[PDB]
Amino acid sequence: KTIKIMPVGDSCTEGMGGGEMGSYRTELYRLLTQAGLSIDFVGSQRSGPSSLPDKDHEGHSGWTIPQIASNINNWLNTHNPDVVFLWIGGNDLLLNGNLNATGLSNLIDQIFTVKPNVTLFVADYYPWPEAIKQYNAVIPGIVQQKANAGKKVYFVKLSEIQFDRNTDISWDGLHLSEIGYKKIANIWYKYTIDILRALAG
Amino acid sequence: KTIKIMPVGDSCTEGMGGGEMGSYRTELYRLLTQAGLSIDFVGSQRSGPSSLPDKDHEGHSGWTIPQIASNINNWLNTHNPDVVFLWIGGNDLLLNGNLNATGLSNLIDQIFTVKPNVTLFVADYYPWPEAIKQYNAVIPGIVQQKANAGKKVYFVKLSEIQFDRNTDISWDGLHLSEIGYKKIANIWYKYTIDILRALAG
Ligand SMILES: [Ca+2]
Ligand SMILES: [Ca+2]
């Protein structure tokens, strides 16, 4: 079965930094395809290097949780994904001075309200800037609460990256380099492959 | 008549910096629509803020003249634009150490070979980094040579921007801010509106 996956997020999903606006999608598409899966990335945005065959996504540079929440019902209905890769909330902290634990929790609930049968992955951030660790701390507990209730939501610990600022951060000093995005892609793979293979089988 | 316009370029067209990957397209779409024109931006990329109704383009962050040349025949045939807004070559200088006057000249010729009836606008750059001025210098003469021969190619002097590094450059120190992109949009408008109104009428 072809699996429709909607990458939803901020500039880390749209792909600012290195990698020609492919984010982790370039390498992850490779890994999932090599694993024998048929993947359709879905979303209305389109960006990436020439090498990425499927450049569709819902990554929006600059966006916060409530901005995603304001539009995601439409995106879900338009694209009807089987799986959502959600990576969001850094801008709530860094742009809005909000640790938005409640917003994230509510957004997860909202996604399942609109698409009850979807499988949802929720990521934390690589540890840069240092301040983001404060937000990373709250995410595993939020996800675990929903999972314990029977929701198909799973945590992707991107913060387990073997982080090296001299290789993994782009020329802009904030966003990931191509190498950093490859490391991130490998962590998505680690945390998603077994569930994806089950959905495909 | 609806005018199909294909924005072709590098990160300055894709929209790195400020403005949520809308580049000059956000403000220029407004200005052209306010002027009474029906504009369809065309291209396979899609990015921009929620406010931009038409987010299609062929801006590719990181790309050089030969990379554009390698693919533009396909883009032209796929999208069949009436007008091309070409803004390219900064990366040839800054990434490849090539002042690519010959590449630009050949790319202009190539565009008309594939689409003889197209109208082409060719831009120089805002003067940042300082080094880009060396490339800006060569562009007007290349365009004028082709125009004198009867080609529908026109120079857009983006370098006439009233440049203020404290307002016009984004947090990354290289790409334009939202304000900078608005200034650029106004210069595109200045140099294109009369020709566009004629094409529409
Ligand atoms: Ca797709
Ligand atoms: Ca369009």
The torsion angles phi and psi of A121, rounded to 5 degrees, stand at -110, 135
Cα(A46) to ligand 1 centroid in Å equals: 9
The beta-carbon neighbor of A46 closest among B45, B62, B173 is B45
Q: Are B71 and B60 in contact (CB under 8 A)?
A: no
Q: In the 3-class helix/strand/coil scheme, how is B12-44 assigned residue by residue? A: HHHCCCCCCCCCCHHHHHHHHHHCCCCEEECCC
**Rounded CA separation A11/A174 (Å):** 11
* Number of residues that this document lists for chain A: 201
Asked whether the beta carbons of residue A47 and residue B20 sit closer than 8 angstroms, the reply is no
Identify the three-state secondary structure at position A103.
Answer: helix
Question: Which 8-state DSSP code applies to residue A8?
Answer: E
Tokens encoding A68: 């995603």
Cα(A85) to ligand 1 centroid in Å equals: 14
**Rounded CA separation B165/A40 (Å):** 42
Asked whether the beta carbons of residue B46 and residue A50 sit closer than 8 angstroms, the reply is no
Contact list, B74 vs chain A (CB under 8 Å) = none
Of all ligands present, the nearest one to the C-alpha of B43 is: 2
Asked whether the beta carbons of residue B47 and residue A44 sit closer than 8 angstroms, the reply is no
**Rounded CA separation A21/A163 (Å):** 21
Q: Are A62 and B20 in contact (CB under 8 A)?
A: yes
Cα(B40) to ligand 2 centroid in Å equals: 4
Identify the three-state secondary structure at position A117.
Answer: coil
Identify the three-state secondary structure at position B183.
Answer: helix
Smallest Cα distance from B197 to chain A, Å: 30
Of all ligands present, the nearest one to the C-alpha of B46 is: 2
Dihedral of CA B58/B11/A124/A75: which sign? negative
Q: Are A159 and A126 in contact (CB under 8 A)?
A: yes
- Separation in Å, CA A58 to CA A14, A25, B7: 7, 11, 22
The beta-carbon neighbor of A60 closest among B20, B60, B61 is B20
Q: Are A103 and A111 in contact (CB under 8 A)?
A: no
Asked whether the beta carbons of residue A46 and residue B46 sit closer than 8 angstroms, the reply is yes
Closest residue in chain B to residue A20, using alpha carbons only: B61
The torsion angles phi and psi of B46, rounded to 5 degrees, stand at -150, 120
Tokens encoding A101: 């634990």
Q: Give residue B71's identity as a one-letter amino acid code.
A: N
R_g (Cα) of chain A, nearest Å: 15
**Rounded CA separation B96/B131 (Å):** 13
The beta-carbon neighbor of B47 closest among A47, A63, A172 is A47
The beta-carbon neighbor of B20 closest among A21, A47, A61 is A61
Give the list of residues 6+ apart from residue B192 with CB closer than 8 angstroms, or none: B83, B85, B121, B154, B156
Smallest Cα distance from B176 to chain A, Å: 13
Contact list, A44 vs chain B (CB under 8 Å) = 46
- B6, containing H or E segment: strand B3-9
**Rounded CA separation B63/A20 (Å):** 9
Tokens encoding B157: 């002097």
Contact list, A47 vs chain B (CB under 8 Å) = 14, 21, 45-47
The beta-carbon neighbor of A20 closest among B47, B49, B62 is B62
User: String of b and e for B168-200 (b: at least 16 CB within 10 Å)?
Assistant: bbbebebbbbbbbbbbbbebbbebbeeebeebb
Q: Give residue A40's identity as a one-letter amino acid code.
A: D
- The residue among B11, B23, B46, B51 with the most chain A CBs within 10 A of its CB, best to mutate, is B46
Could you give the domains of chain A? 1-201 (3.40.50.1110)
- The residue among B13, B44, B45, B61 with the most chain A CBs within 10 A of its CB, best to mutate, is B61
Asked whether the beta carbons of residue B50 and residue A71 sit closer than 8 angstroms, the reply is yes
Contact list, B16 vs chain A (CB under 8 Å) = 16
Q: Are A40 and A5 in contact (CB under 8 A)?
A: yes
**Rounded CA separation B50/B22 (Å):** 9
Tokens encoding B147: 């125009």
Contact list, A16 vs chain B (CB under 8 Å) = 16
Give the list of residues 6+ apart from residue B99 with CB closer than 8 angstroms, or none: B92, B93, B134, B135, B138
Q: Give residue A5's identity as a one-letter amino acid code.
A: I
* One-character DSSP codes across B111-146: HHHH-TT-EEEEE---S-SGGGHHHHTTHHHHHHHH
